[PDB]
Amino acid sequence: EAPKNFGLDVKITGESENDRDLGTAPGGTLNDIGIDLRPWAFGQWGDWSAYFMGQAVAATDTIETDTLQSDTDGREPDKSYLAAREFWVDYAGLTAYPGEHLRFGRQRLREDSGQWQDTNIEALNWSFETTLLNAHAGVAQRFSEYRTDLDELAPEDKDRTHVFGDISTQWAPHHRIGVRIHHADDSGHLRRPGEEVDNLDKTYTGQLTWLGIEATGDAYNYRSSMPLNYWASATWLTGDRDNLTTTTVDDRRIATGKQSGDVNAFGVDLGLRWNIDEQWKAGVGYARGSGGGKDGEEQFQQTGLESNRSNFTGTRSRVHRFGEAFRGELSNLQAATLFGSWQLREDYDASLVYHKFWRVDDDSDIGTSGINAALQPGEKDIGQELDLVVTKYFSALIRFRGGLFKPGDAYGPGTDSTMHRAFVDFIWRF
Ligand SMILES: CCCCCCC/C=C\CCCCCC(=O)OC[C@@H](O)CO
Ligand SMILES: CCCCCCC/C=C\CCCCCC(=O)OC[C@@H](O)CO
Ligand SMILES: CCCCCCC/C=C\CCCCCC(=O)OC[C@@H](O)CO
Ligand SMILES: CCCCCCC/C=C\CCCCCC(=O)OC[C@H](O)CO
Ligand SMILES: CCCCCCC/C=C\CCCCCC(=O)OC[C@H](O)CO
Ligand SMILES: CCCCCCC/C=C\CCCCCC(=O)OC[C@H](O)CO
Ligand SMILES: CCCCCCCCCCCC[N+](C)(C)[O-]
Ligand SMILES: CCCCCCCCCCCC[N+](C)(C)[O-]
Ligand SMILES: CCCCCCCCCCCC[N+](C)(C)[O-]
Ligand SMILES: CCCCCCCCCCCC[N+](C)(C)[O-]
Ligand SMILES: [Ca+2]
Ligand code: NA
Ligand code: NA
């Protein structure tokens, strides 16, 4: 029971993916296995503490062993690599509240929805968590991937600074109301007209502010004592973007200029979960990120730090809010969701999730997704998905996570009728 100074997490993962581009491009499917080793070190001395976690990965192909991985020349991952995941120092002595502390270094930033921040990033982050009042404030920026195989940052991350904060209160037992803010500022520059544009150039620079209000009733508490749980959130995105314009000239992309415009967009996510008994749960969700509008002003996007993974099905396992296969970003996207889940004590859980997805504006792209295929102008029907997650907890666990995506009319002729992405993870902690 003495404070544990080190450990090692060992994960074996298999991934089957077919076909991310729906058959539109060559190869690019996965059926592969890998091991991921994460040694960690922790020290604590009165109000001070410090932590390091590293990572070594070897796999048969470039599979996803980390749900929080950076998305990917200079950005080509290798089948095997080393990385530094977290390295930070923490000071808890500003106040006597044990849930209050200040953390500096590359660290896990997470809030419960996963929709604003859920990532490892260099940050200075203040947390204040007590029974009646929670608050946080921080700043973050990526300076490197800290990986042996990736030499450059993604253009969206380069020179982008994040500032954010939140504050919330438990106004009745198990019911929380709060506000949340995030601001992203780009100090980079766009290619100038006539310059060649490649995959490591920015497509835009922005100064963007998200302002959100969030109500939850054990939304993400898998151990809730209430028969009904819920989440409701509404988020306003404002600010501006300078968008790069380009043209094609001889199989090469050339910058032609740029266009600025204000953003005035809106996102909402609602959910209701029935705690039917000690084991069974089921629920419904609706979410929408606005799209299109006059000069793209209504195109909602997320912060870029989000995972969209959360305990929304009411289990210990986190699930992708917009599908393991589709992996939607809330951006010109409407989603309806139904789920059921089962758990037995701390020993097993399982969730079955259905989604239907539509575009909001049928002449605009959606944001990120786990699908790499062009949408047909004028078609709103993105598709449907069924997901299954099943876990046995032995510390250690073994989990199946799978999604089956059925493309709708927005994907069109010559695309596959079905696509899946599935994982098995076996994890042991020493
Ligand atoms: C701004 C980034 C800060 C990065 C700090 C990285 C911290 C690295 C490793 C965490 C553990 C350091 C422990 C150092 C140490 O000698 O601890 C004494 C320990 O043996 C018993 O308490
Ligand atoms: C230990 C506690 C210290 C608190 C330090 C102060 C933290 C400051 C701000 C936290 C809230 C995030 C700020 C969001 C923001 O400033 O941008 C909005 C603005 O750009 C709209 O145009
Ligand atoms: C209770 C039913 C579970 C619902 C399905 C959730 C599991 C998701 C994926 C399982 C792997 C299926 C892989 C084969 C398949 O169905 O599609 C073939 C297609 O991907 C060819 O491109
Ligand atoms: C308390 C002192 C000990 C600190 C822990 C040392 C652990 C060993 C390595 C930490 C990770 C340093 C990696 C830095 C790095 O990868 O450089 C990134 C490049 O600049 C690429 O942009
Ligand atoms: C502009 C009108 C917006 C009205 C929104 C009202 C939302 C009402 C109910 C949604 C769920 C609220 C739960 C409140 C609740 O259960 O707490 C009451 C206390 O537990 C009393 O013991
Ligand atoms: C397919 C590869 C392995 C991935 C699967 C990991 C989870 C495996 C099995 C979980 C089984 C879920 C049902 C458990 C059940 O019905 O009751 C458990 C018993 O009551 C306790 O022994
Ligand atoms: C024990 C559970 C068995 C079901 C696991 C499903 C994993 C997906 C493998 C499907 C591969 C088929 N194909 C040809 C589409 O790649
Ligand atoms: C059931 C869903 C998880 C898929 C597991 C993926 C298969 C792992 C082992 C087969 C791949 C190894 N190999 C030989 C193709 O490199
Ligand atoms: C198992 C822990 C390993 C920790 C060290 C990993 C950091 C190495 C990063 C080197 C980056 C080299 N690069 C990308 C500039 O070519
Ligand atoms: C599609 C999922 C939507 C929510 C499911 C609703 C669950 C209602 C369960 C009623 C069962 C009443 N019972 C069995 C406890 O006496
Ligand atoms: Ca392909
Ligand atoms: Na403290
Ligand atoms: Na629950």
Numbering used by the authors: 37 to 108, 117 to 438, 455 to 490
Manuscript excerpt for this entry:
In the periplasm, M is randomly epimerized to G or partially acetylated, and the mature alginate is directed to the transmembrane β-barrel protein AlgE in the outer membrane for conveyance to the extracellular space. Briefly, the structures include 18 antiparallel strands (S1–S18) that cross the membrane to varying degrees, nine extracellular loops (L1–L9) and eight periplasmic turns (T1–T8). The loops and turns range in size from two to 43 residues, with L1 coordinating a calcium ion. Both the N- and C-termini are in the periplasm. The cavity within the AlgE barrel has been proposed to act as a pore for alginate, a random, linear copolymer of 1,4-linked β-d-mannuronic acid (M) and its C-5 epimer α-l-guluronic acid (G).
The best crystals were obtained with 7.8 MAG at 20°C. These yielded three crystal forms in space groups C2, P212121, P21 that diffracted to 1.9, 2.4 and 2.8 Å resolution, respectively. AlgE-1.9 has one molecule in the asymmetric unit. In the AlgE-1.9 structure, electron density located toward the mid-membrane plane of the barrel and a little off-centre in the barrel cavity was well fitted by a citrate molecule. Citrate was present in the precipitant solution used for crystallization and is the likely source of the anion. We propose therefore that citrate acts as a mimic of the M and G components of alginate in AlgE-1.9. Further, its location within the 10 Å diameter electropositive pore serves to identify it as a limiting structure through which alginate passes in its transit across the protein and the outer membrane.
